Amino acid sequence: AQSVPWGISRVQAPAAHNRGLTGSGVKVAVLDTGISTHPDLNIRGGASFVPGEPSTQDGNGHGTHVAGTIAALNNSIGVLGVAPSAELYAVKVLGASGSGSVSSIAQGLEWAGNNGMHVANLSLGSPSPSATLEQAVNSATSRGVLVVAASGNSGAGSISYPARYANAMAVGATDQNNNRASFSQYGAGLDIVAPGVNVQSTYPGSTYASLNGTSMATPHVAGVAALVKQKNPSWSNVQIRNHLKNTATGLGNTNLYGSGLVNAEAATR
Ligand SMILES: [Ca+2]
Structure with missing residues (x-):
């Protein structure tokens, strides 16, 4: 059984999936502790810049969790x-x-x-x-x-x-x-x-874990940027950034929230 974490529903990612947008053909680099092999992840490649570590295996858990919020299968x-x-x-x-x-x-x-x-x-x-x-x-x-x-x-x-x-x-x-x-x-x-409290995602050892942090919010926005890039392949990084801000749901003062909550339905309309 596959579950949809609350944050994935909150940014309305299922609505963009129903339009046929899934991030196909978009390359997303996760700069973190590594990403471990998992049955619910497909890792295309990568590189290690940690001294004396040739592999991109995750020795922490954080990188694999972030990766699953962006692209769990x-x-x-x-x-x-x-x-x-x-x-x-x-x-x-x-x-x-x-x-x-x-x-x-x-x-x-x-x-x-x-x-x-x-x-x-x-x-x-x-x-x-x-x-x-x-x-x-x-x-x-x-x-x-x-x-x-x-x-x-x-x-x-x-x-x-x-x-x-x-x-x-x-x-x-x-x-x-x-x-x-x-x-x-x-x-x-x-x-x-974007959602950053009790975010369930993939974890090393072929399991799942719930974590809290702005590190959990960031992959929701990276993921919606990949859906917009699939819809609009000619758009620049700046165009995608501005479109995400322009279509976010305002939540109050921008000092606290920036443009508000990222919204994948509004961004892929
Ligand atoms: Ca899955």
Whole structure:
């Protein structure tokens, strides 16, 4: 039996699937702890930038969970991703502790840009600004990648890096009431929000787990960006970003919510 997690229904991904849009032909790089093999995931390739780790296997769980919110297969098991036919690439930039360096994150972004990824999901943050990060987001954006990044989980009124930079689409987290989740960082630079509380998805060891975080909200927006790219193959990263903001359901003040809740039905109309 396949279940549809509440967040997938909340962003109205099933409505876009009924229009025949599933993210087919869209390449999505998940820059995280890796992605492990799972019966409800199909991983196309990837690269590791973690010192002394040649593989893209997930030693943490986080990367595999994020991957399942974007693209868990539409079948008779597990869950269902926002864009279940997207081509997933595992770009391992964080180690087993969930930590990484600005150098591995920046190498991952350069790989995404050099390998023609359409969307790069960064469910990660650095507490401090980094010129290296800004430059790598800008480089990947110039090559055509839409970078989507988590605002962070401190609950503060400023968002983390690289989400704060102009060329990153910053994603905050909502709960089941469509309120901002208490941990979700907000403030200047916030673009959009998506479900980030009790998000069930794929996990290592062929299982499933429920997690909370702006890292869970970010893949919902990366997934809806892949549905828009399938509908509109000639659109640029900037066009997709603006269309996602323009069609989001407003939830209140933009300092707290950006443009509001991502809406895959309205974005694929
Ligand atoms: Ca499934």
